[PDB]
Design a protein around this ligand. Structure first.
Ligand SMILES: Cc1cc(C)c2[nH]ccc2c1CN1CCCC[C@H]1c1ccccc1
Length: 288
């Protein structure tokens, strides 16, 4: 149950990020090819809901861990009940990513090893121990430790032919938060919406742009991967990658046009805790 730690030599890829899961869409199309996820217990991978088809979800993807070729048997897919990509079509919002989180329940128990390990989740005893915090620590205190009102150093991971690349980003959670959120208006399809908070709800964290540093941006293939805070050799998931303003894997023209506003948006796991806590209640993670 020691979450968020590497399991030791100075190896690469899944040795350095052993919670990462790779998801492939079984019947792919443009914008619907791949996703990422995080191992969160021996039976569960956390990802984005938009990675699946709404009908027969369980047979719509394959998932692999540890950089393996083999795919794991998926017993059930649990979407957050509030997720509905079509929910704001009325308002001229063609895709709406509020509550874009889902849990993959695997039929078979994972065996943890050097390349397969769980990441810590917010508001758990695993996170308390990982941050070397006292047993009096509350969920609010973990939130203060992990997401202070500042630009927060964080990271995500991109994958390509079993190779992982770690990318450092900053969560704009202080005085730049409003500016980061307002930049949703640069996203194709989001430019006409009068009140941007209709697209950027209280569920989201915001990264990207060039201040305080030049953050790399996500691609659609990174959807569902963990947004992670690294403290003293431990890794805590704080978010799930949901959607971005610029897809730098295709249209690199655009990011060069609007670098100051090229943001990525992530589901804040502190904002979906009732759902995580209930669905993971039997996984020995010790939610507070
Ligand atoms: C879904 C999704 C998920 C992730 C992690 C992404 N990362 C980068 C883009 C991207 C999209 C695509 N995007 C979603 C919001 C509306 C804009 C749209 C878009 C379309 C074409 C170019 C740029 C943005």
């Amino acid at each position: 149950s020691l979450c968020g730690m590497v399991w030791h030599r100075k190896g690469t890829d899944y040795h350095k990020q052993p919670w990462q899961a790779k998801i492939s869409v079984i019947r792919p199309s443009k914008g619907h090819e791949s996703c990422m996820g995080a191992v969160v217990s021996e039976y569960f991978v956390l990802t984005a809901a938009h990675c699946f088809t709404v009908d027969d979800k369980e047979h719509s993807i394959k998932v692999s861990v540890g950089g393996e070729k083999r795919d794991l048997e998926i017993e059930v897919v649990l979407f957050h009940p509030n997720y509905n990509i079509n929910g704001k079509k009325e308002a001229g919002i063609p895709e709406f990513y509020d509550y874009d989180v889902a849990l993959i329940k695997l039929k078979n128990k994972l065996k943890y090893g050097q390349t397969i390990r769980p990441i810590c989740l917010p508001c758990t005893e695993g996170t308390t121990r990982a941050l070397r915090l006292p047993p009096t620590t509350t969920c609010q205190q973990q939130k203060e430790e992990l997401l202070p009102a500042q630009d927060i150093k964080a990271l995500f991971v991109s994958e390509e032919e079993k190779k992982l690349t770690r990318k450092e980003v900053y969560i704009k959670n202080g005085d730049k938060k409003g500016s980061c959120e307002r930049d949703a208006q640069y996203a194709p399809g989001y430019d006409k919406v009068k009140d941007i908070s209709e697209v950027v709800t209280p569920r989201f964290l915001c990264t990207g742009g060039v201040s305080p540093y030049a953050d790399p941006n996500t691609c659609r293939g990174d959807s569902g991967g963990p947004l992670i805070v690294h403290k003293r050799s431990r890794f805590i998931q704080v978010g799930v990658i949901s959607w971005g303003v610029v897809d730098v894997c295709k249209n690199q023209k655009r990011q060069k046009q609007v670098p100051a506003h090229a943001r990525d948006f992530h589901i804040n796991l502190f904002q979906v805790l009732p759902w995580l806590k209930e669905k993971l209640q039997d996984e020995d993670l010790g939610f507070l």
